[PDB]
CSV table of C-alpha atoms in Angstrom, one decimal:
chain,number,residue,atom,x,y,z
A,1,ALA,CA,176.6,11.0,-26.0
A,2,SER,CA,173.8,8.5,-25.2
A,3,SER,CA,173.9,5.5,-22.9
A,4,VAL,CA,174.2,5.7,-19.1
A,5,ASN,CA,176.8,2.9,-19.1
A,6,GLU,CA,179.3,5.6,-20.1
A,7,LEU,CA,179.3,7.4,-16.7
A,8,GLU,CA,181.1,4.3,-15.4
A,9,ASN,CA,184.3,5.1,-17.3
A,10,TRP,CA,186.1,7.3,-14.8
A,11,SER,CA,188.4,8.7,-17.4
A,12,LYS,CA,185.8,9.8,-19.9
A,13,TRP,CA,182.6,10.2,-17.9
A,14,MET,CA,182.1,13.8,-19.0
A,15,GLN,CA,181.6,12.7,-22.6
A,16,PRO,CA,177.9,11.6,-22.4
A,17,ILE,CA,176.8,14.8,-20.7
A,18,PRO,CA,175.4,17.3,-23.3
A,19,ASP,CA,177.6,20.2,-24.3
A,20,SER,CA,174.7,22.5,-23.3
A,21,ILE,CA,174.6,21.9,-19.5
A,22,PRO,CA,176.4,24.7,-17.5
A,23,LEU,CA,179.2,23.2,-15.5
A,24,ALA,CA,177.3,24.4,-12.4
A,25,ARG,CA,174.5,21.8,-12.7
A,26,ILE,CA,176.9,18.8,-13.2
A,27,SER,CA,177.7,16.8,-10.1
A,28,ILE,CA,181.5,16.7,-10.1
A,29,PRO,CA,183.8,15.0,-7.6
A,30,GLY,CA,187.0,16.9,-6.5
A,31,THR,CA,189.9,16.6,-4.2
A,32,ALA,CA,191.0,18.9,-1.3
A,33,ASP,CA,194.7,19.9,-1.0
A,34,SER,CA,195.2,17.7,-4.1
A,35,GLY,CA,199.0,18.1,-3.8
A,36,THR,CA,199.6,16.6,-0.4
A,37,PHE,CA,200.2,13.1,-1.8
A,38,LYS,CA,204.0,13.5,-1.5
A,39,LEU,CA,204.3,14.0,2.2
A,40,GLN,CA,205.6,10.7,3.5
A,41,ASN,CA,206.9,12.2,6.8
A,42,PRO,CA,204.8,10.9,9.8
A,43,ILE,CA,204.3,14.1,11.8
A,44,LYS,CA,203.7,15.9,8.6
A,45,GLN,CA,201.1,13.4,7.4
A,46,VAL,CA,198.8,13.4,10.5
A,47,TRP,CA,198.5,17.2,9.9
A,48,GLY,CA,199.0,18.0,6.2
A,49,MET,CA,198.5,14.9,4.1
A,50,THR,CA,195.0,14.6,2.6
A,51,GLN,CA,195.7,12.5,-0.5
A,52,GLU,CA,197.7,9.4,-1.2
A,53,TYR,CA,197.9,9.3,-5.0
A,54,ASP,CA,199.0,11.6,-7.7
A,55,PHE,CA,196.9,14.0,-9.8
A,56,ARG,CA,196.7,11.5,-12.7
A,57,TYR,CA,195.4,8.8,-10.3
A,58,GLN,CA,192.9,11.4,-9.0
A,59,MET,CA,191.9,12.3,-12.5
A,60,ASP,CA,191.6,8.7,-13.7
A,61,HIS,CA,189.3,8.2,-10.8
A,62,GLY,CA,186.7,10.7,-12.1
A,63,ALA,CA,187.9,13.8,-10.2
A,64,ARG,CA,187.6,17.1,-12.3
A,65,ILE,CA,188.1,19.7,-9.6
A,66,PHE,CA,191.3,20.4,-7.8
A,67,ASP,CA,192.0,22.3,-4.6
A,68,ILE,CA,195.3,24.0,-5.3
A,69,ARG,CA,196.9,26.3,-2.7
A,70,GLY,CA,200.2,27.8,-3.4
A,71,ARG,CA,202.9,30.3,-2.5
A,72,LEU,CA,205.0,32.8,-4.5
A,73,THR,CA,208.7,32.0,-4.2
A,74,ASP,CA,212.1,33.9,-4.6
A,75,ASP,CA,212.7,32.2,-8.0
A,76,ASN,CA,209.4,33.9,-9.0
A,77,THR,CA,207.3,30.7,-9.4
A,78,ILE,CA,204.2,29.3,-7.7
A,79,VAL,CA,204.7,26.1,-5.6
A,80,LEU,CA,202.2,24.1,-3.6
A,81,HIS,CA,201.8,24.7,0.2
A,82,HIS,CA,199.7,23.7,3.1
A,83,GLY,CA,200.0,26.5,5.6
A,84,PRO,CA,203.8,26.8,6.2
A,85,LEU,CA,204.6,23.3,4.7
A,86,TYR,CA,206.1,23.1,1.3
A,87,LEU,CA,204.5,20.2,-0.5
A,88,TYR,CA,207.4,19.2,-2.9
A,89,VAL,CA,205.0,19.8,-5.8
A,90,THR,CA,204.6,22.8,-8.1
A,91,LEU,CA,202.0,24.6,-10.3
A,92,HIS,CA,203.8,23.5,-13.5
A,93,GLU,CA,203.7,19.9,-12.3
A,94,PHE,CA,199.9,20.2,-11.8
A,95,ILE,CA,199.4,21.9,-15.2
A,96,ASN,CA,201.4,19.4,-17.1
A,97,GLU,CA,199.5,16.4,-15.6
A,98,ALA,CA,196.2,18.3,-16.4
A,99,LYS,CA,197.3,18.7,-20.0
A,100,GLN,CA,198.5,15.1,-20.5
A,101,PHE,CA,195.2,13.8,-19.1
A,102,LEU,CA,193.2,16.4,-21.2
A,103,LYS,CA,195.2,15.1,-24.2
A,104,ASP,CA,194.3,11.4,-23.6
A,105,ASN,CA,190.7,12.2,-22.8
A,106,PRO,CA,189.7,15.5,-24.7
A,107,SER,CA,186.0,15.0,-23.8
A,108,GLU,CA,186.8,16.2,-20.3
A,109,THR,CA,187.7,19.5,-18.5
A,110,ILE,CA,189.2,20.4,-15.1
A,111,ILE,CA,188.2,23.2,-12.8
A,112,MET,CA,191.3,24.5,-11.0
A,113,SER,CA,190.8,26.3,-7.7
A,114,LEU,CA,193.8,28.6,-7.0
A,115,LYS,CA,194.2,29.9,-3.5
A,116,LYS,CA,197.1,31.9,-2.1
A,117,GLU,CA,198.0,29.5,0.8
A,118,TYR,CA,201.0,31.2,2.2
A,119,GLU,CA,202.7,34.6,2.1
A,120,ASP,CA,205.0,35.4,-0.8
A,121,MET,CA,208.6,34.8,0.0
A,122,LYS,CA,210.6,37.8,1.0
A,123,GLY,CA,212.3,38.6,-2.3
A,124,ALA,CA,209.6,37.9,-4.9
A,125,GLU,CA,209.7,40.2,-7.9
A,126,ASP,CA,206.0,40.5,-8.5
A,127,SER,CA,202.7,39.9,-6.6
A,128,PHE,CA,201.0,36.5,-6.4
A,129,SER,CA,198.2,37.4,-8.8
A,130,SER,CA,200.4,39.0,-11.5
A,131,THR,CA,203.0,36.2,-11.3
A,132,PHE,CA,200.4,33.6,-12.0
A,133,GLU,CA,198.6,35.5,-14.7
A,134,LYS,CA,201.8,36.5,-16.6
A,135,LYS,CA,203.7,33.3,-16.3
A,136,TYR,CA,200.9,30.7,-16.2
A,137,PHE,CA,197.3,31.8,-16.9
A,138,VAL,CA,198.4,33.2,-20.2
A,139,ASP,CA,198.7,29.5,-21.4
A,140,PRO,CA,196.1,28.4,-24.0
A,141,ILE,CA,194.7,25.4,-22.0
A,142,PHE,CA,193.0,28.0,-19.7
A,143,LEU,CA,189.5,28.9,-20.8
A,144,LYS,CA,189.3,32.8,-20.8
A,145,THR,CA,185.5,33.0,-21.2
A,146,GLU,CA,183.3,33.9,-18.2
A,147,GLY,CA,179.6,33.8,-17.3
A,148,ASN,CA,177.8,30.5,-16.6
A,149,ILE,CA,180.4,28.4,-18.4
A,150,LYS,CA,178.9,25.4,-20.3
A,151,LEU,CA,180.5,22.0,-20.8
A,152,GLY,CA,181.0,22.5,-24.6
A,153,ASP,CA,183.2,25.5,-24.2
A,154,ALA,CA,185.3,23.8,-21.5
A,155,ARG,CA,186.1,20.4,-23.1
A,156,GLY,CA,189.9,20.2,-23.6
A,157,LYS,CA,190.5,23.3,-21.6
A,158,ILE,CA,191.2,24.1,-17.9
A,159,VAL,CA,188.5,26.2,-16.1
A,160,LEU,CA,189.9,28.4,-13.4
A,161,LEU,CA,188.2,29.2,-10.1
A,162,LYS,CA,189.9,32.2,-8.6
A,163,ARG,CA,190.4,32.1,-4.9
A,164,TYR,CA,192.7,35.1,-5.1
A,165,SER,CA,191.6,38.7,-5.3
A,166,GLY,CA,194.2,40.7,-7.3
A,167,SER,CA,193.1,39.2,-10.7
A,168,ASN,CA,193.3,41.3,-13.9
A,169,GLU,CA,192.8,38.8,-16.7
A,170,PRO,CA,189.3,37.5,-17.8
A,171,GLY,CA,188.6,33.8,-17.5
A,172,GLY,CA,186.8,31.2,-15.4
A,173,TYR,CA,184.9,32.0,-12.2
A,174,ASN,CA,185.7,35.4,-10.6
A,175,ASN,CA,186.9,35.6,-7.0
A,176,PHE,CA,184.0,35.7,-4.5
A,177,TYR,CA,183.4,36.4,-0.7
A,178,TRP,CA,184.3,33.0,0.9
A,179,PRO,CA,184.2,33.4,4.8
A,180,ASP,CA,186.4,31.3,7.1
A,181,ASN,CA,185.2,27.9,8.3
A,182,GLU,CA,181.6,28.3,7.3
A,183,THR,CA,178.6,27.5,5.1
A,184,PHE,CA,177.6,30.5,3.0
A,185,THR,CA,176.0,31.8,-0.2
A,186,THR,CA,177.1,34.7,-2.5
A,187,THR,CA,177.0,35.8,-6.1
A,188,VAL,CA,179.7,34.8,-8.6
A,189,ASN,CA,179.5,36.2,-12.1
A,190,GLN,CA,176.6,38.1,-13.7
A,191,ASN,CA,174.1,35.3,-13.2
A,192,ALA,CA,175.7,32.5,-11.2
A,193,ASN,CA,174.7,32.2,-7.5
A,194,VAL,CA,176.9,30.1,-5.1
A,195,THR,CA,176.5,28.1,-1.9
A,196,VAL,CA,179.6,26.6,-0.3
A,197,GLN,CA,179.9,24.3,2.7
A,198,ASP,CA,183.5,24.6,3.9
A,199,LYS,CA,183.4,23.9,7.6
A,200,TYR,CA,186.9,22.4,7.9
A,201,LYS,CA,188.0,22.0,11.6
A,202,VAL,CA,184.6,21.2,13.2
A,203,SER,CA,183.1,18.3,15.2
A,204,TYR,CA,182.5,15.0,13.4
A,205,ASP,CA,178.7,15.3,14.0
A,206,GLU,CA,178.4,19.0,13.1
A,207,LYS,CA,180.4,18.3,10.0
A,208,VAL,CA,178.4,15.3,8.7
A,209,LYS,CA,175.2,17.2,9.3
A,210,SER,CA,176.4,20.2,7.2
A,211,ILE,CA,177.4,18.0,4.3
A,212,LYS,CA,174.0,16.4,4.3
A,213,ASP,CA,172.1,19.7,4.9
A,214,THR,CA,173.8,21.4,1.9
A,215,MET,CA,173.5,18.2,-0.1
A,216,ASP,CA,169.8,18.2,0.7
A,217,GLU,CA,169.4,21.8,-0.5
A,218,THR,CA,171.1,21.0,-3.8
A,219,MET,CA,169.2,17.8,-4.6
A,220,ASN,CA,166.0,19.9,-4.0
A,221,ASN,CA,167.2,22.8,-6.2
A,222,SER,CA,168.3,20.4,-8.9
A,223,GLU,CA,166.9,22.4,-11.8
A,224,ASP,CA,168.6,25.6,-10.8
A,225,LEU,CA,171.4,26.0,-13.4
A,226,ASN,CA,172.5,29.4,-12.2
A,227,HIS,CA,173.6,28.1,-8.8
A,228,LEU,CA,176.9,26.6,-7.8
A,229,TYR,CA,176.8,24.1,-4.9
A,230,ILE,CA,180.2,23.3,-3.5
A,231,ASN,CA,180.3,20.7,-0.7
A,232,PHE,CA,183.6,20.0,1.1
A,233,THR,CA,183.6,16.6,2.8
A,234,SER,CA,187.1,17.3,4.3
A,235,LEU,CA,187.6,17.7,8.0
A,236,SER,CA,191.0,19.1,8.9
A,237,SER,CA,192.0,19.0,12.5
A,238,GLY,CA,194.9,18.6,14.9
A,239,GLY,CA,195.0,14.9,14.1
A,240,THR,CA,197.8,12.8,15.5
A,241,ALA,CA,195.5,11.0,17.9
A,242,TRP,CA,193.3,9.4,15.2
A,243,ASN,CA,191.8,12.9,14.5
A,244,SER,CA,193.7,13.0,11.2
A,245,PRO,CA,192.0,13.7,7.9
A,246,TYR,CA,192.5,10.0,7.2
A,247,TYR,CA,190.4,8.9,10.2
A,248,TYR,CA,187.5,11.3,9.5
A,249,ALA,CA,187.5,10.5,5.7
A,250,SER,CA,187.5,6.8,6.7
A,251,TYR,CA,184.0,7.4,7.9
A,252,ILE,CA,182.7,10.4,6.1
A,253,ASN,CA,183.5,9.1,2.6
A,254,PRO,CA,181.5,5.8,2.9
A,255,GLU,CA,178.7,7.4,4.9
A,256,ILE,CA,178.1,10.3,2.4
A,257,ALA,CA,178.5,7.8,-0.5
A,258,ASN,CA,175.6,5.8,0.9
A,259,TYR,CA,173.5,9.0,1.6
A,260,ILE,CA,173.5,9.6,-2.1
A,261,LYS,CA,173.3,6.0,-3.0
A,262,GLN,CA,170.0,5.6,-1.2
A,263,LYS,CA,168.4,9.0,-2.0
A,264,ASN,CA,168.8,8.6,-5.8
A,265,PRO,CA,169.1,12.4,-6.2
A,266,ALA,CA,169.2,14.2,-9.6
A,267,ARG,CA,171.9,16.6,-8.5
A,268,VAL,CA,174.5,16.5,-5.6
A,269,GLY,CA,176.6,19.5,-6.6
A,270,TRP,CA,180.4,19.7,-6.4
A,271,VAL,CA,181.7,17.3,-3.8
A,272,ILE,CA,185.3,18.0,-2.8
A,273,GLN,CA,186.7,15.2,-0.7
A,274,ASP,CA,189.9,13.8,1.0
A,275,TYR,CA,191.6,10.5,0.4
A,276,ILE,CA,190.1,9.6,-3.0
A,277,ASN,CA,190.8,5.9,-3.3
A,278,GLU,CA,189.5,2.4,-3.7
A,279,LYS,CA,189.7,1.6,0.0
A,280,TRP,CA,186.3,2.8,1.4
A,281,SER,CA,183.3,0.5,0.7
A,282,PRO,CA,180.7,2.5,-1.3
A,283,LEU,CA,183.0,5.0,-3.2
A,284,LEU,CA,182.0,8.6,-2.8
A,285,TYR,CA,183.3,9.8,-6.2
A,286,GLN,CA,181.7,7.0,-8.2
A,287,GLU,CA,178.3,7.8,-6.6
A,288,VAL,CA,178.6,11.6,-7.3
A,289,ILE,CA,179.3,10.8,-11.0
A,290,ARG,CA,176.3,8.5,-11.3
A,291,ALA,CA,173.9,11.2,-10.0
A,292,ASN,CA,174.3,12.8,-13.5
A,293,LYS,CA,172.4,10.0,-15.2
A,294,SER,CA,169.6,12.6,-15.1
A,295,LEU,CA,171.5,14.4,-17.9
A,296,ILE,CA,171.8,11.5,-20.3
């Protein structure tokens, strides 16, 4: 759809973007540990909590990528975890919300990253991979087509990004290398190339630099469609003493928002952040969305 004024609607901003653009090229905001918005326990928040509002709030705020880490339970279901902490949220809960939103705004899609956060409970019937694929992935909202997935094929569906290895069912982005606390580049599907900046638990300076460096690489390689650029703005650390993901995000979000705001880039990549809200001054997510005007 024409008109750039349509990227300002946070619920339907993916409508104006042509059905032809591979999802890879689109600058899309996301959320890290999207299911940590339920922890209201103090000592749990300074460590675990990275979000303050529900999936629907996150989605209504332009986010279209979710960082979902779960665990296989005794009752043979997948629930959301953060290391050893149960998040009082489930996979079914995420999927329902994703469907409702996708039902109110069919011109959109949602990429769901699925990572096996904690070890299966001692008593599970099946494996983490099979449990998800046989009781969940088999649901019709999930796009089962692979390759460099375009926007047209994904509208109304849920695109999956496999962070688990034991997969057996076709669909979404296959599982790739992904090293611990690093910045790297591998190959995804047949064509798709991928660069990921996931330096969680690092110094404020080293972090901020990395976000910018990878962000610089992407805005320079803006016309490369067969290249996924994932940029995590999240800085996990042994908080408590104002080292919490809330403190870091309190600075990183506005800062990075401005970095894009002043550079007027054509592409920024997939920017996964913490504390998506209306608190911080420039708004990281709103800027990331605007950097797509080069597609309208």
